[PDB]
Design a protein around this ligand. Structure first.
Ligand SMILES: [Mg+2]
Ligand SMILES: [Mg+2]
Ligand SMILES: [Mg+2]
Ligand SMILES: [Mg+2]
Ligand SMILES: [Mg+2]
Ligand SMILES: [Mg+2]
Ligand SMILES: [Mg+2]
Ligand SMILES: [Mg+2]
Ligand SMILES: [Mg+2]
Ligand SMILES: [Mg+2]
Ligand SMILES: [Mg+2]
Ligand SMILES: [Mg+2]
Ligand SMILES: [Mg+2]
Ligand SMILES: [Mg+2]
Ligand SMILES: [Mg+2]
Ligand SMILES: [Mg+2]
Ligand SMILES: [Mg+2]
Ligand SMILES: [Mg+2]
Ligand SMILES: [Mg+2]
Ligand SMILES: [Mg+2]
Ligand SMILES: [Mg+2]
Ligand SMILES: [Mg+2]
Ligand SMILES: [Mg+2]
Ligand SMILES: [Mg+2]
Ligand SMILES: [Mg+2]
Ligand SMILES: [Mg+2]
Ligand SMILES: [Mg+2]
Ligand SMILES: [Mg+2]
Ligand SMILES: [Mg+2]
Ligand SMILES: [Mg+2]
Ligand SMILES: [Mg+2]
Ligand SMILES: [Zn+2]
Lengths: 45, 229, 146, 96, 57, 112
RNA sequence: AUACUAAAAUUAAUAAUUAUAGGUUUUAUAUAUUAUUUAUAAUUAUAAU
RNA sequence: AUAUAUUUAAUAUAUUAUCUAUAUUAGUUUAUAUUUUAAUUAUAUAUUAUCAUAGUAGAU
RNA sequence: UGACUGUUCGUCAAUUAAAAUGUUACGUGAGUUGGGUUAAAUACGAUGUGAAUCAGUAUGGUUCCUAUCUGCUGAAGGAAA
RNA sequence: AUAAUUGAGGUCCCGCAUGAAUGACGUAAUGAUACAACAACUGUCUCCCCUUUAAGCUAAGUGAAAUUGAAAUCGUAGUGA
RNA sequence: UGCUGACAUGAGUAACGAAAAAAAGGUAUAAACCUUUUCACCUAAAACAUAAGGUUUAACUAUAAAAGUACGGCCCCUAAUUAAAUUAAAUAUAAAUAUAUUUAAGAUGGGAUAAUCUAUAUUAAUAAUUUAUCUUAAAAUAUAUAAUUAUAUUAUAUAUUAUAUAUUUAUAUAAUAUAAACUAAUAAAGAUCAGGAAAAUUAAUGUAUACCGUAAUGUAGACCGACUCAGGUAUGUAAGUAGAGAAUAUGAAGGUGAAUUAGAUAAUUAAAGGGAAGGAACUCGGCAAAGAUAGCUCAUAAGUUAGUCAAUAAAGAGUAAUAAGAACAAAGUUGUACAACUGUUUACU
RNA sequence: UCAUCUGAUUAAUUGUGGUUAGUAGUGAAAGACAAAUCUGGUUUGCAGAUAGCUGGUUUUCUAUGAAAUAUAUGUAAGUA
């Protein structure tokens, strides 16, 4: 039985999608800049 | 199995438990309110229990007595507030009905309950003593109280008593000493007066009661029946 | 599982009477103990000191400063910077501490007003703000002197 | 209430957004506000902002005497008892 | 019932007003694994030990 | 399984209010209560009178409110110190305002 | 008689006459022990489960 | 054991009512059981009830 | 009515007075089944250099529907008798 | 082998179009594999009956769905994209 | 089969999601909230502790309290791994970058001491893959005539008493004291699949003990499933009685009886129970449903690759049982085709 | 879901973290899985891709008013 694909764990989620993860890599930086340009309020977890 | 009793949307055991419980509660409290159907079945049980008790009290046969006792035990839950219920049945409850042949319980239709529309009823023991000492009144028989209230109302209005009311009174009397009945009525009446706004003159009230009793106690078409020509 | 067969083995020889030891403790209970109603602690047992330093969080001994018993903003004025400028360091320090103390008393009261009654009058808040202004002025003056 | 909001300032951005409502949608919020206040609290005059409100820069001062025109009591005389800063308005003794 | 004034089945939640919301929000001390230590600008006071203790300076 | 067409206003009306079965009847069966001349359903105890009786019974057969022995002579100040009254949650508050969600039996008219 | 309805029976309580369900009584049935018994009188007599 | 009346010379006897079949300690860590010790802390007593597919089976 | 076969058919067995031939979307899957039969897996024979293919063979293997109207089976209410 | 066998097992060999690591051939064990036979047991069936519970039905409370050109939406024969 | 909004139709229809409730009183306000009693349901759980998770849901704003020892984090130490980080010229490459090498980060692991309660700081000197604990031996208890037979005991885990040495506090000794389970620590040792990495001692001088987690929910109405969704979700304790067991029955204690009730129980459906005479005549096909004459101890052929493989063989016996009489484990024999076998596969035909 | 059935000391099951994927990884191999399903995901962009195909293209009144033949066409649903 599918449907329950997101299996929350705070550690994994901060480590993968978190602000610090984004800011550490060049690709991540691009993403953050993109979100800033769009004016998103929340740049990442 | 089919058509011997109500089913009440419960499987056997549960139904049995319910009915026994209801009987026990009735014995405890003298009067209870529930759904009509439940009441109707509960009465059947309760009446049977009462009769068994009576038989136990009466019959000389030791064997029979024992058997009846056993049956009574089976038909109850003697645990919490029903722990002394066995004693109560023999000592207090059963004696009231020694002369009365069946009809120990009375079911009275109420209004269907608002939320569910389920038809409700009062189930109660018939001749329950209305006056406990060190207490004033008892949580007794509703019908009697209602009758008394009706009588009071009539008196207030200065109207004659309805024939139906009189009939009811007569019924109440049948298995009741006169003096005792009078006393009971008096006890009820004062309380009722207190509850209501109406005033209370003792002697007058007593006189009225006496009058009511007297009529009750000492008893007193277009179609012509004719033989075949 | 238990079945038609079932030979239940006995417990033990329970060491023959003579072999046992005497129990280390003999007399145990008081086989006569009553369950009495509890005995709630009373404040009469205390002697709450009058000059207790925690009274310093209230104006006088009073839960709330009444609207009448507050200093009205017509009378009260915050300290000026220039005026402060000619004040000793020690004195300034003292003033600051006094201000802080006042704020604390206001602060508690303000909290009470907000959280419980849920009032929006904010006189206390205003007072606190005024005090804060004075404090900041003092700070500025201190910096400036240096 | 029962909040602890007073002790903190959180959701600062959100507060700013809700505090600095664009002025062309000010009618909206104000209407709602009007709807949700009793008759004795509410006043017909429009509020002025912290920048728009003046501080003197008033043409009058509480205490002095004043004539009121163009109202129901036009041509009235009254002592101006106090001012309401937010609204840039005066409250007049017993009259007006 | 959960709450007796709501008898009938409405669009009401067991608690609160909406299950969903912005999850991308600064996390506090209360959330996370056992190992997640946030801290509150309270202790740059002493020094941690080799063994787990804390020696104040 | 499924309607072939939108059911016309007429047709639905006649299905609903057309037949007798689906209509509410008038409760003809109702009469005076012997104790107080108010309306009541036939073959049924008056709901007011019975209620009154029940109330009286309750008053008489009231159980003794078992008040603790200590708290009766417990100083007001002391009480305050001990048991300070907290703020109740929203849910609790809601529960408390029973009048909002709970119904008291209505009284009938007087029969003539 | 019956999904709900409809059908059919009763709603007697006074000068008479009419039992609808529950109960109550009756005999009967069902169970499974019972004459080594129960009931009445004084281990004995009579009636019988 | 307690409560309530009785007799006795508060105490004891007996009557009525209510409540009670516990609990603590030993036997080398733990848990359970047994037996001892403590305590008023019980019946190879009559009768029930619940659950086990209506617990299962024989009749009905 | 049976044995055989997915079989309708057909070959037998036992009967029967007889075991007639059709039409009804070769009646009837919003009535049932899904054995045959046109999917995905796999194998065998054959064809193709090969992917793969077959008027082949074999094992496995997926649709669901609370009934608005007609209609029909019952049961009522209204009605002009 | 069955009363009766297009199924099963054995054997015969015009192998339409077997065959040796695309392995050939017989065997023990194993297999929720796929065919078949016997025993036992049964509502699978002859042939259905009864009983229980949850639904269905009625009363109260809440309250969907696909669908929908508009409908004042009968039968038959004929007609006709 | 336009798009958005509004409003219809089906329709006051289906459904309201695993189900045990009753009374009295709160409250002449209650099927649904609370309390009491009765009854039931879960109980190697629907309980009690917890991990993760999350709109704080909690017994709440007057709120979840730690120097640490059968308390966790941080901290020290590393694993797997990660790191526009680090060597005229580390090496390579259209750019982005990639690479080995150092340095740092990185728990799911390791980390002194301690109720006869314990001190981590500063300075100076020079471990464990799995698995078993048998046999023997020793001594003990009874029969029989030192030696034989039969039986249990045998490495550790305290308390009490009596002794000898330092002086009631210490040391060592002797004697006394149940069962079957479990735990930890000890020693010894069998298998092949050969079983982590990383941070010294003494002396002197010291110590005022930081920060954060802590509610409740957690086989669920409080997580992941669009829903207060019969699904998914990690760990420990899991009263007795019984039994080989965490099987199965009960259930002491605790918890729970629910966002639908009340009646009625037509046809009909689901999930059960029973069924005379037949016994596969059903059907594609015994599908489905029946069907167990010990679960302990004996006894068990052909065939065979020699493995009680076949085998839990079928049949059969011992103990129990003479027709009335729990639940759960346990459902036959044989032939053929295909594939040696245990495994893996199309999450959803 | 219920019943029934299979493995149940191992090529076992499982927690916590990590690595490998979009010409592309993982795969006891089923084109199976790579966030409700892939003979190759998703998102943003190229982008108003292209469509000899389907559908759609909104007031009125007046006058005139056809064709479905021939030829050619990778042409026969088109176009000259
Ligand atoms: Mg999702
Ligand atoms: Mg990565
Ligand atoms: Mg959620
Ligand atoms: Mg947490
Ligand atoms: Mg008669
Ligand atoms: Mg149970
Ligand atoms: Mg059809
Ligand atoms: Mg059709
Ligand atoms: Mg299969
Ligand atoms: Mg081969
Ligand atoms: Mg296998
Ligand atoms: Mg309804
Ligand atoms: Mg349109
Ligand atoms: Mg319908
Ligand atoms: Mg219906
Ligand atoms: Mg329904
Ligand atoms: Mg429910
Ligand atoms: Mg109530
Ligand atoms: Mg147990
Ligand atoms: Mg818990
Ligand atoms: Mg490190
Ligand atoms: Mg759920
Ligand atoms: Mg056939
Ligand atoms: Mg056949
Ligand atoms: Mg089995
Ligand atoms: Mg195989
Ligand atoms: Mg993993
Ligand atoms: Mg393929
Ligand atoms: Mg695979
Ligand atoms: Mg023309
Ligand atoms: Mg074309
Ligand atoms: Zn009345």
């Amino acid at each position: 039985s599918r449907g329950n694909t997101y299996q929350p764990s705070t550690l994994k989620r901060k480590r993968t999608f978190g602000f610090l993860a984004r800011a550490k890599s060049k690709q991540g930086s691009k993403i953050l800049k993109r979100r800033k340009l769009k004016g998103r309020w929340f740049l990442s977890h | 199995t089919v058509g011997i009793a109500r089913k009440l949307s419960r499987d056997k055991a549960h139904r049995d438990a319910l009915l026994k419980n209801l009987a026990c509660q009735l014995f405890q409290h003298e009067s209870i309110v529930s759904t009509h159907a439940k009441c109707k079945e509960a009465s059947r049980v309760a009446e049977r229990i009462i009769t068994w008790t009576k038989r136990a009290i009466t019959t000389s046969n030791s064997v029979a007595q024992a058997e009846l006792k056993s049956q009574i035990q089976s038909q109850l839950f003697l645990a919490g507030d029903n722990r002394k219920l066995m004693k109560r049945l023999f000592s207090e409850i059963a004696p009231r009905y020694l002369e009365r042949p069946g009809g120990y319980t009375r079911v009275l239709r109420l209004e269907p309950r608002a939320n569910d529309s389920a038809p409700q009823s009062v189930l109660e023991l018939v001749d329950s003593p209305v006056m406990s000492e060190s207490h004033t009144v008892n949580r007794g028989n509703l019908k009697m109280w209602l009758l008394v209230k009706s009588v009071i109302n009539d008196d207030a209005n200065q109207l004659p008593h309805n024939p139906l009311t009189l009939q009811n009174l007569h019924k109440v009397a049948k298995f009741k000493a006169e003096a005792q009945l009078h006393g009971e009525i008096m006890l009820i009446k004062q309380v009722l007066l207190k509850e209501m706004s109406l005033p209370y003159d003792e002697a007058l009230e007593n006189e009225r009661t006496q009058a009511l009793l007297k009529e009750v106690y000492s008893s007193s078409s277009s179609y012509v029946m004719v033989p075949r020509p | 599982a238990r079945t038609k067969f079932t030979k239940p083995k006995p417990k033990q020889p329970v060491l023959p009477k003579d072999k046992i030891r005497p129990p280390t403790q003999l007399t145990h209970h008081s086989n006569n103990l009553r369950i009495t109603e509890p005995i709630p602690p009373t404040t009469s047992n205390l002697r709450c000191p009058d000059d207790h330093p925690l009274w310093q969080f209230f104006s006088n001994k009073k839960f709330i400063r009444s609207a009448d018993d507050l200093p009205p903003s017509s009378h009260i004025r915050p300290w000026s910077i220039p005026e402060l400028r000619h004040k000793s360091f020690n004195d300034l320090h003292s003033l600051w501490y006094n201000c802080l103390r006042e704020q604390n008393v206001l602060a508690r009261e303000n909290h009470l007003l907000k959280n419980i009654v849920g009032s929006t009058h904010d006189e206390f808040s205003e007072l606190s703000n005024s005090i804060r202004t004075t404090m900041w002025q003092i700070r500025h003056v201190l910096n400036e002197r240096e | 209430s029962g909040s602890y909001q007073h002790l903190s300032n959180v959701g600062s951005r959100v507060m700013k957004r809700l505090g600095n409502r664009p002025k062309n949608f000010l009618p909206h919020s104000e209407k709602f506000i009007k709807k949700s206040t009793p008759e004795f609290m509410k006043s017909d005059l429009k509020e002025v902002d912290e920048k728009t409100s003046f501080k003197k820069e008033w043409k009058f001062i509480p205490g002095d005497r004043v004539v009121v025109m163009s109202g129901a009591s036009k041509g009235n005389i009254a002592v101006i008892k106090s001012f309401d800063k937010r609204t840039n308005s005066f409250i007049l003794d017993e009259n007006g | 019932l959960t709450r007796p004034w709501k008898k009938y089945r409405d669009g009401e939640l067991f608690y609160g007003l909406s299950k969903v919301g912005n999850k991308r929000v600064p996390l506090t001390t209360k959330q996370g694994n056992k190992t997640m230590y946030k801290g509150t600008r309270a202790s740059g006071i002493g020094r941690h030990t080799k063994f787990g203790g804390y020696v104040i300076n | 399984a499924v309607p072939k067409k939108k059911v016309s206003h007429q047709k639905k009306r006649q299905k609903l209010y057309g037949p007798g079965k689906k209509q509410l009847k008038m409760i003809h069966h109702l009469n005076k209560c012997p104790s107080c001349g108010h309306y009541k359903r036939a073959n049924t105890l008056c709901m007011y009178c019975v209620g009154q009786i029940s109330h009286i019974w309750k008053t008489h057969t009231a159980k003794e409110e078992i008040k603790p022995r200590q708290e009766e002579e417990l100083s007001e100040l002391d009480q305050r110190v001990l048991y300070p009254g907290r703020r109740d949650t929203k849910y609790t508050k809601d529960l408390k305002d029973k009048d909002n969600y709970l119904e008291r039996r209505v009284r009938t008219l007087k029969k003539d």
